[PDB]
């Protein structure tokens, strides 16, 4: 905390304020995250993340716990995907770059998932990009450490847009499939230049999902009608063709996206199988203009 000079507020994250900072001694530029409460379970979970190192995962440099306050020190990246998508609304991200980013994000997932660590709150705001054509996932593993609240510490609404349907339907246990759902929602958003499912409450989110993909049933999703927040009185909507949902996307893309958005989490494609999908046959790594 005093080992760091604040350079600038980046924003108010899920768990606290996020700062760009400089290591006062070493001069290293880092992202400093304050985690508002701390519990031994959290400290032990966090420490395990220091080993979860991968080029597509923002590096956890240190955990500082002093005076019952908690700070996480990460590798700093200059830009996130949400700002990048906004900045390129006029023209859209070129497909070769969307493809490269999707490819790298799936690599990040495949790595963490193989160590059985989930993100659970993937969203454009925590996908970070550099001037080298790289993209990295920020805040991996934190949801398991600190929970995911409804409001941030500054009362901002945590988005539901990328939340998997099994969460919304009140599953007690999350699998890695929840991240593949979020990431498919982001893939669709990069392609169309519009969020796929911009829900503004849990039921609005669910009902937006049903409107596009069909109200799930026992045929598409064995066991769905027995989940805690499922109701027989949900309206029954018919599925739309993906040709209509993500129009410009080619047949490989639409086929991969559909597998990433399968209702049944057990059927939803894994990150590892997604990397082998023919969509990625001609993948390259362009530099974004930035």
DSSP 159: P
Which residue from 24, 78, 115, 194 is in contact with ligand CT6, where contact means CB under 6 A?
78
Q: How far apart are CA 207 and CA 224, in angstroms?
A: 15
Residue among 77 and 95 whose Cβ is closer to ligand CT6: 77
Residue span binding ligand CT6 (CB under 6 A) among the ranges 6-14, 111-119, 164-172, 194-202: 6-14
Q: Is the CB of 76 or the CB of 181 nearer to ligand CT6?
A: 76
Which among 108-116, 125-133, 142-150, 232-240 is the span making contact with ligand CT6, rule CB under 6 A? 125-133
Encoded tokens for 4: 């760091």
Distance CA 107, CA 11 (A): 27
Give CA–CA dist 244/126, Å, rounded. 28
Residue of 86, 121, 217, 250 marked active site: 121
Q: Has 121 been annotated as catalytic?
A: yes
Note whether 137 and 105 are within 8 A (CB).
yes
Numbered residues of the known binding site for Mg(2+): 126, 139
Per the DSSP assignment, residues forming a β-bridge with 4 are 23
Which residues lie closer than 8 Å to 229 by C-beta, 6 or more apart? Answer: 168, 169, 170, 202
Identify the sign of the CA torsion 119, 112, 93, 181: negative
Angle at 269 between CA 263 and CA 275, to 5 degrees: 150
7 counts as binding ligand CT6 under rule CB under 6 A? no
Tokens of 44: 């032990």
CB of 275 to ligand CT6, least distance (A): 24
Q: Which of 11, 39, 55, 222: binder of ligand CT6 (CB under 6 A)?
A: 11
Residue placing its CB nearer to ligand CT6 in the complex, 74 or 210: 74
- By the rule CB under 6 A, 105 interacts with ligand CT6: no
Give the tokens for residue 134.
Answer: 């790289």
Q: Which residue in 125, 159, 175, 212 binds ligand CT6 (CB under 6 A)?
A: 125
Q: Using the rule CB under 6 A, is 76 a contact of ligand CT6?
A: yes
- What's the closest the beta carbon of residue 33 comes to ligand CT6, in angstroms? 7
C-beta of 209: minimal distance to ligand CT6 in Å? 24
Sole window of 9-17, 88-96, 197-205, 279-287 interacting with ligand CT6 (rule: CB under 6 A): 9-17
- Write out the binding residues for ATP: 10-18, 33, 75-77, 80, 123-126, 139
CA distances from 66 to 2, 19, 22, 38, 141 (A): 11, 18, 19, 10, 21
Instruction: Residue 207: name the closest of 219, 215, 196 by CA.
Output: 215
Burial zone of 266 (CB within 10 Å; 0-12 exposed, 13-18 middle, 19+ buried)? exposed
46 near ligand CT6, rule: CB under 6 A: no
Q: What are phi and psi of 146, to 5 degrees?
A: -120, 5
138 contributes a contact to ligand CT6 by CB under 6 A? yes
Closest CA to 22 of 34, 30, 10: 30
Question: Per rule CB under 6 A, is residue 18 in the interface with ligand CT6?
Answer: yes
Q: Cβ closer to ligand CT6: 49 or 206?
A: 49
Q: Catalog residues that contact ligand CT6 under the rule CB under 6 A.
A: 10-13, 18, 20, 31, 58, 74-80, 125-126, 128, 138
């Amino acid at each position: 905390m005093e080992n760091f000079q604040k350079v600038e507020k980046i924003g108010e994250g899920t768990y606290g304020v996020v700062y760009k900072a400089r290591n006062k001694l070493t001069g290293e530029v880092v992202a400093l995250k304050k985690i508002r409460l701390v519990p031994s379970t959290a400290i032990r979970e966090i420490s395990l993340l220091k080993e979860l190192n991968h080029p597509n995962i923002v590096k956890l440099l240190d955990v500082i716990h002093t005076e019952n306050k908690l700070y996480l020190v990460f590798e700093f990246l200059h830009q996130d995907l949400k700002k990048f998508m906004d900045a390129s609304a006029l023209t859209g991200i070129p497909l070769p770059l969307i493809k490269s980013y999707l490819f790298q994000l799936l690599q990040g997932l495949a790595f963490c998932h193989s160590h059985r660590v989930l993100h659970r709150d993937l969203k454009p705001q925590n996908l970070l990009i550099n001037t080298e054509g790289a993209i990295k996932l920020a805040d991996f593993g934190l949801a398991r450490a600190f929970g995911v609240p409804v409001r941030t510490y500054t009362h901002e609404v945590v988005t539901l847009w990328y939340r998997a349907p099994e969460i919304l339907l009140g599953c007690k246990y999350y699998s890695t499939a929840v991240d593949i759902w979020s990431l498919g929602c982001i893939f669709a958003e990069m392609v169309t230049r519009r969020a796929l499912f911009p829900g503004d409450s849990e039921i609005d989110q669910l009902f937006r999902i049903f409107r596009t993909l069909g109200t799930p049933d026992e045929v598409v999703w064995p066991g769905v009608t027995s989940m805690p927040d499922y109701k027989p009185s949900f309206p029954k909507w018919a599925r739309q063709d993906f040709s209509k949902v993500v129009p410009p996307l080619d047949e490989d893309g639409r086929s991969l996206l559909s597998q990433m958005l399968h209702y049944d989490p057990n059927k939803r494609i894994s990150a590892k199988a997604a990397l082998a999908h023919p969509f990625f046959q001609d993948v390259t790594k362009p530099v974004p203009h930035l």
